[PDB]
């Protein structure tokens, strides 16, 4: 009989709560060294063989296979922070892992029901958002010098801090190019193109507005340099089109077979005449190009590029302003790309690269990153996406909050004053969030080589003096305020980090049993 075929034996009670808390703490313990400007790096080995070396929180979690079911929920928390914002993925797990670590001596010790704690976690979440809103100050979003110091917040931890002066100029012009007036700037990562070119120097880089294609020219006579280029995008292949009806031709007369091949040559010549009506200087298609259509376009000076990526055509239409039209009969002068210039094919031994330079507010840009190796170049790509994600929340809302240990401790001090005034059953779980916000500033000291005992003891005494700007230095470990050094981070990063940790803690505290063998 066996009754249930899936986990007929059951683990319930405190045994299931310990397994959920211990596994959740193990997720945050491995990334403790990944927090702070002195943070180390972690290397990951996939079954495919590709090596990923980074200090990013999300990149470490998603590439590790965790057999513990409840600990897998910790792996998806960084995806929520990465997809919505992209910055702060490491502090989410450290905070959420510390909550369950602090909430452990309750169900076992105080015997407090989880829902009673959940009601306290929701009330502490509302008060935490108010403290973060009070410590946040607005700044000018149109100041270019002010936004350069904000991008350096996430760069200070990353290895690109040496190039930070150069990297901020790359990320600033990239977000400003794709943004447009309409929900405010509505910028999207899909419009920003980051191309990875092995070799070169990181110090030498530039933001290019256009699309960088690795495809070569289809014919040697094609001019690789055009003063005033004209781009016309065509989804239809220049090869002879065949009907899907599977038409079978019965040939009887001797002149019927010779005429079929001639008509195939006349239509290819006819489709070229429809293109030459607007006289484009450039031709770009996403499919193959026949060798017959190449000669007819040599007289008009039409450079043809074949097998272009589908998503790249939409990025060409933004910079060049051309309209994608599948049929050659609807081609008009308005559909021809305009304002584009500086078309040149630079010769590099690895691949042929084509350049575009722009002179309907949506635009696109292609950032050319030159690293020392392919794997380091993969790191700058990830560091550039997180650098541009910081400028997004600054343009969405003017609110700007402190960082580096000041915001986390500013909430813990406000939670200590209200805790003593509750005088009830919810007083114990309400104090768990106050001690949970201390892990982030404590980790910054442990990675800096300082003494967390004496620094955090005097740190809480400073916040009681009425100033919320007191942080923790990452190098010297000084208690000096963050206004002097200039660490500031968007409030959205601080809000999404606290909201995700509270919602995740309430999920794992409600699991009283773990069963397997379902095989859905």
């Amino acid at each position: 009989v066996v009754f249930m075929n899936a986990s007929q034996e059951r683990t319930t009670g405190r045994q299931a709560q310990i397994s959920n808390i211990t596994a959740a703490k193990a997720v945050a313990d491995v990334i403790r060294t990944c927090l702070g400007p002195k943070a180390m790096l972690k290397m990951l080995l996939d079954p495919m063989g590709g090596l990923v070396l980074t200090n990013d929180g999300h990149a470490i979690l998603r590439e590790i296979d965790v057999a513990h079911p409840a600990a897998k929920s910790m792996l998806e928390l960084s995806r929520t922070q990465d997809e919505e914002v992209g910055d702060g993925t490491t502090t989410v797990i450290i905070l959420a892992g510390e909550i369950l670590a602090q909430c452990a001596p309750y169900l076992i010790e105080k015997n407090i029901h989880p829902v009673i704690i959940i009601q306290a976690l929701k009330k502490a979440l509302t008060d935490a958002l108010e403290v973060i809103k009070q410590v946040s100050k607005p700044v000018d979003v149109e100041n270019d010098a002010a936004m350069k110091k904000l991008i350096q917040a996430s760069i200070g931890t990353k290895y690109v801090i040496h190039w930070s002066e150069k990297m901020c100029e790359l990320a600033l012009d990239a977000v400003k190019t794709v943004r447009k007036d309409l929900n405010f700037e509505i910028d999207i990562k899909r419009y920003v193109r980051v191309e990875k070119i092995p070799g070169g120097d990181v110090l030498d880089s530039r933001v290019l507005k256009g699309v960088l294609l690795n495809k070569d020219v289809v014919h040697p006579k094609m001019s690789r340099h055009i003063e005033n280029p004209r781009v016309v995008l065509l989804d239809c292949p220049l090869e002879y089109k065949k009907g899907e009806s599977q038409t079978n031709i019965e040939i009887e007369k001797e002149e019927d077979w010779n005429r079929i091949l001639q008509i195939e040559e006349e239509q290819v010549q006819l489709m070229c005449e429809q293109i030459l009506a607007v006289r484009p200087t450039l031709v770009i298609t996403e499919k193959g190009v026949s060798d017959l259509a190449q000669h007819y376009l040599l007289k008009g000076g039409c450079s043809v590029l074949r097998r272009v990526k589908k998503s790249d055509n939409n990025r060409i239409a933004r910079v060049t302003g051309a309209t994608i039209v599948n049929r050659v009969e609807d081609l008009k002068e308005s559909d021809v790309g305009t304002n584009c210039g500086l078309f040149k094919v630079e010769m590099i031994g690895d691949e042929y690269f084509s350049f575009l330079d722009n002179c309907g507010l949506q635009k696109a840009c292609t950032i050319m990153l030159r690293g020392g190796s392919k794997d380091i170049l993969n790191e700058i790509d990830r560091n550039l996406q997180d650098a541009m994600a910081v400028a997004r929340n600054v343009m969405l809302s003017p609110s700007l909050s402190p960082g580096g240990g000041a915001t986390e401790m500013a909430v813990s001090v406000k939670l200590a004053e209200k805790a003593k005034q509750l005088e009830g059953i919810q007083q114990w779980p309400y104090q768990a969030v106050a001690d949970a916000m201390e892990c982030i500033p404590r980790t910054l000291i442990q990675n800096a080589g300082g003494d967390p005992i004496r620094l955090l003891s005097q740190l809480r005494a400073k916040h009681a003096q009425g100033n919320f700007t007191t942080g923790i230095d990452g190098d010297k470990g000084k208690i000096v305020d963050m206004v002097s050094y200039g660490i500031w981070e968007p409030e959205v990063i601080k809000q999404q980090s606290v909201k995700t940790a509270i919602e995740s803690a309430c999920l794992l505290l409600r699991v009283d049993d773990i069963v397997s063998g379902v095989r859905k």
Binding site: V1, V2, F3, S7, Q8, E9, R10
Partner: protein, 536 residues
């Protein structure tokens, strides 16, 4: 189960449990398989069965006690019927095949009552009350034969002998077997015709010759021959004599030695020469003590050295060697002698007396066996059986053994009945008559016990090729018309269903145990509910 192994008792999956109606059906069918085997061998028209032993030896018998003893079974209910016939053979020794058929007949009638919703204890309570009503009824019908003299008392012993000799192999010689079985008790018995000792009669089988050579010999039959066979085989007494003066000695002929381990140290040649004379003086002294006592044949338990072969040959003293200790007890009883522990205690009053001591050649080679005869009535009777097959010599032992068990039961006073199915029919109608007066819930209990007693007469009609319906209806109609209980089934078909004219006689103590062993065993079987049988 909740997900954890639940084991109350070690070897959980090995042992099985039976309960409910399926547990009762398996117990009844287990007895029906044993019954249908025994029902074929019941009655003088029955047939024997071959018993193959794991060692290769075979046994052919119809005896329910012997068949079930060597039978390898599995179910424990069928093993309870094994000791049922064993209980019948050990005490009474007669009716071993009838207790199995009667017990299964009680279980067959009980299965029909269980399906009707009757509690098993109510079924067992009805069989216990019906068993005493049948015994008390047959006890009033029988008569006491003790008023007859010793001349007629021998006739009643010949009547019950010929009945027990039937149904078994070599039943053509039963006429002479019945005569020899009674004469053994005539010679060995108490003067008051009571409490005869059965152990004084020994059963000694011999393989060879024919069955017609079986005869009674009063004395001791030993497998050992005369030592140093230069002496005459047949020993004859002196012209005038009181007897042969048989001597029995449990001490071998040796120079005296301590029982404890001893060390005899000879420190000089003179001490060694004295041992030479001391050696021959003892062998000369031991042979003179027998000659002065007048003894002739000397029996030794441990034998003797070759020194005394010629010594006893000069004095014409027969001697045997390596006689078992159990046989020495058998020798002193026949000759009425006394075992002499040592030559210093040897006297003429302790010597045994028998008529003649001789040996038989038997077959071609075989072995030499000694035979002793008595000149008058003694306390020892040895049975002598011959046969042309090893299986015949074997079964004939227990065939006459069971015949002696019937005669020794007749030694008990004032118990006799007539067999041939006349006892079961008389006791059947007495139980069915009480069922109409009692009524109640036990009315069906007396019916099941009455139908079970009629199975034995109906089984006799099956082996004889008769109609069990027409035979049982004739017996029941005869007991209602007339009070004579002597009408029964005839499997030999000589006519005259009256048992008085056919002389068939059975012991009442044997028939009384058949009802007691069958009823009391079914009372325990019907109480069995949970059956736990461990795997072998």
């Amino acid at each position: 189960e909740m997900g954890r192994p639940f084991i109350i008792v070690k070897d959980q999956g090995n042992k099985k449990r039976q309960h409910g109606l399926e547990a009762k059906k398996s117990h009844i069918l287990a007895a029906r398989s044993v019954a249908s085997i025994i029902k074929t061998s019941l009655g003088p028209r029955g047939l024997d069965k071959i018993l193959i032993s794991p060692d290769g030896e075979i046994t052919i018998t119809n005896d329910g006690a012997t068949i079930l003893s060597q039978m390898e079974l599995d179910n424990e209910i069928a093993k309870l019927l094994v000791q049922l016939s064993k209980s019948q053979d050990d005490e009474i020794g007669d009716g071993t095949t009838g207790v199995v058929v009667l017990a299964s007949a009680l279980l067959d009638q009980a299965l029909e009552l269980i399906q009707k919703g009757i509690h098993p204890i109510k079924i067992a309570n009805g069989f216990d009350e019906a068993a005493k009503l049948a015994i008390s009824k047959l006890e009033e019908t029988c008569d006491d034969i003790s008023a007859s003299n010793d001349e007629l008392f021998r006739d009643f012993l010949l009547r019950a002998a010929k009945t027990s000799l039937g149904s078994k192999i070599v039943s053509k010689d039963h006429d002479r077997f019945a005569e020899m079985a009674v004469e053994a008790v005539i010679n060995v018995m108490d003067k008051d015709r009571k409490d005869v000792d059965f152990d004084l009669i020994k059963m000694q089988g011999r393989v060879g010759g024919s069955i017609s050579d079986s005869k009674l010999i009063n004395g001791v039959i030993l497998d050992k021959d005369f030592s140093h066979p230069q002496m005459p085989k047949c020993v004859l007494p002196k012209e005038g004599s009181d007897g042969v003066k048989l001597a029995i000695l449990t001490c071998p002929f040796e120079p005296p030695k301590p029982k404890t381990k001893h060390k005899l140290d000879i420190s000089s040649v003179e001490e060694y020469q004295k041992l030479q004379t001391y050696e021959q003086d003892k062998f000369k002294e031991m042979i003179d003590d027998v000659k002065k006592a007048g003894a002739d044949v000397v029996i030794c338990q441990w034998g003797f050295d070759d020194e005394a072969n010629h010594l006893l040959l000069q004095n014409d003293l027969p001697a045997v060697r390596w006689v078992g200790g159990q046989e020495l007890e058998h020798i002193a009883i026949s000759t009425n002698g006394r075992i002499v522990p040592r030559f210093q205690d040897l006297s003429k009053d302790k010597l045994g007396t028998c008529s003649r001591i001789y040996e038989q050649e038997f077959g071609t080679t075989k072995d030499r066996m000694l035979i002793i005869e008595q000149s008058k009535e003694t306390k020892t009777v040895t049975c002598f059986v011959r046969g042309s097959n090893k299986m015949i010599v074997d079964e004939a032992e227990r065939a006459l053994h069971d015949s002696l068990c019937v005669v020794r039961n007749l030694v008990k006073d004032s118990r006799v009945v007539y067999g041939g199915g006349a006892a079961e029919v008389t006791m059947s109608l007495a139980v069915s008559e009480e069922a109409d007066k009692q009524r109640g819930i036990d009315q069906y209990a007396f019916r099941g016990f009455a139908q079970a007693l009629d199975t034995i007469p109906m089984t006799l009609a099956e082996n004889s090729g008769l109609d069990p319906i027409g035979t049982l209806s004739t017996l029941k109609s005869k007991q209602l018309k007339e009070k004579i209980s002597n009408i029964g089934v005839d499997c030999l078909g000589y006519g005259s269903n009256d048992m008085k004219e056919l002389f068939v006689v059975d012991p009442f103590i044997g028939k009384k145990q058949q009802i007691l062993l069958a009823t009391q065993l079914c009372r325990m079987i019907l109480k069995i509910d949970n059956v736990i049988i461990s795997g072998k």
